[PDB]
Amino acid sequence: DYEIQRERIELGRCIGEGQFGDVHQGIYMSPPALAVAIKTCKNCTSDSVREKFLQEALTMRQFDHPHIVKLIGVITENPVWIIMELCTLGELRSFLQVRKYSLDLASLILYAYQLSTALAYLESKRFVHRDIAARNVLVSSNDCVKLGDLPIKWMAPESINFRRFTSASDVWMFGVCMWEILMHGVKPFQGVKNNDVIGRIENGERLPMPPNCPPTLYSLMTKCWAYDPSRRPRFTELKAQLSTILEEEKAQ
């Protein structure tokens, strides 16, 4: 039973925004004082919105991975809330930007490694994500990131051209996500028009090597960006390669 008694929740300060409403941090008193994230729903007094909001919680129930945010429970009567595991440090993009000059390379590589483990897990569950980007990643601690919950600049050419979405197109998007982390949260193709992104990629052009990114890690990003989806590594191969790049970086 995922239904939580409202009196067990102390609503704290607003910490961010979601599609349905504000996200707040708070406290969950269970049989004691667990820090939680509380997702609110502005229009949940309407059942069409309520069903869509609560469907997200039902989706979360299916996953059990250390690098995917966990659902704690729901409050189905107005105001409708979803109680999630709190990732205290917030959104990854903002975290990377604020810590641009204070996060070492080993930490950046660790975040890419952890995200590849969560994605190889979702691949093993036969779940295609379709929206892999640094914006949907949350920070639990300085050493732990988690997956939370058209973007032409992040999309595989087959997804843009023919709406083909597979684990291989998720790999392309993850290559862009790895570039974003190594770029300290800078978005890809800044100042480039969406309709001119496909052309540049068709021309063989790719996102450049981020400053201070190891060549072995940049090489792994470019394999994610092979035009042919069958030539892209699988998430399991990404995981094994990122583990070796992480160890090499941890050794100096």
Ligand SMILES: O=C1CN2C(=NN1)COc1ccccc12
């Ligand atoms: O499910 C969640 C959603 N979330 C948090 N934790 N857990 C904390 O950082 C956030 C920042 C912005 C939006 C959502 C969150």
